[PDB]
Design a protein around this ligand. Structure first.
Ligand SMILES: CCCCCCCC
Lengths: 79, 88
């Protein structure tokens, strides 16, 4: 019943292990939902530094027709 | 759940198409960030290329990809710029 969902092309997957860094579109077969946080060590004190997590809102159109699928991509599956 | 550290073979690519003001920020390239999983429900990853190009229905060649992820225990193991993927 989970229909394939296409992640918009500002979020892609770089796979160096198969042939150099290659960006690949992302398909999601969501079983459980999924969030996406950007982490940087920019909460600088006088001595330490902390991590701030700014969530990234990823737009996910669900796939209408399988003809829309690209020639090549990666399928991330969440159970 | 526990924090796994995906090895540099697999990283997230994020492109800033514009700026905050909408300034056309093209020809600057993507930005690759190491991935870390707040992994609850387990996760899979398959490369896919189209095959069976006899027009009938388009088919895809799903070759699984080995996700080498290492459990992290210290903060200096954590880079100063990364991405956290959270699954329930
Ligand atoms: C919304 C992007 C999901 C990327 C998951 C990558 C896990 C190796």
């Amino acid at each position: 019943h989970p229909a394939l969902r296409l992640v918009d092309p500002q979020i892609q997957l770089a796979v160096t292990r198969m042939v150099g860094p290659k960006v690949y579109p992302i398909i999601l077969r969501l079983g459980s939902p999924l969030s996406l946080n950007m982490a940087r060590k920019t909460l600088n004190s006088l001595e330490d530094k902390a991590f701030q997590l700014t969530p990234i809102a990823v737009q996910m159109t669900k796939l209408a027709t399988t003809e829309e699928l690209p020639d090549e991509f990666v399928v991330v599956t969440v159970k």
